[PDB]
Amino acid sequence: LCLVCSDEASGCHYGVLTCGSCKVFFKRAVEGQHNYLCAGRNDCIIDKIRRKNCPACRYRKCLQAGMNLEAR
Ligand SMILES: [Zn+2]
Ligand SMILES: [Zn+2]
């Protein structure tokens, strides 16, 4: 299982067990820089439903997990 948006995972990448989407999400979101932001709220839980409610929490969540797009 995805350890970010707590869904069915499709392999670990960037050092942590994540889904198929969290890989692509993070890899564009880091080495591209996307605007989400939930630093002014920081309310919502990110899971299998609430992932589509906020793509800010899931960015901070994955990093909390131990993600790094220069991981080993
Ligand atoms: Zn995910
Ligand atoms: Zn949020």
Query: Domain residue spans in the chain?
Result: 1-72
Give distance in angstroms: CA of 30 to centre of ligand 1: 15
User: Backbone breaks in the chain (C–N > 2.5 Å) follow which residues?
Assistant: none
Give the number of the ligand closest to the Cα of residue 36: 2
Sequence-separated contacts (24+) of 65-71 with Cβ below 8 Å = 65/3, 65/4, 65/16, 65/18, 66/15, 66/16, 67/4, 67/14, 67/15, 67/16, 67/18, 67/26, 68/14, 68/15, 69/14, 69/26, 69/27, 69/30, 69/31, 71/14, 71/15, 71/16
Fold entry, domain 1-72? Erythroid Transcription Factor GATA-1; Chain A (3.30.50)
**What experimental approach yielded this model?**
NMR
Q: Positive or negative, the Cα torsion across 6, 60, 38, 30?
A: negative
Distance of CA 22 from the midpoint of ligand 1 (Å): 4
Query: Which residues have CB less than 5 Å away from ligand 1 (the ion)?
Result: 2, 4-5, 19, 22
Answer yes or no: are the C-beta atoms of 58 and 42 closer than 8 Å: no
Closest ligand to C-alpha of residue 17 is 1
Helix 21-28, helix 57-65: angle, nearest 10: 100
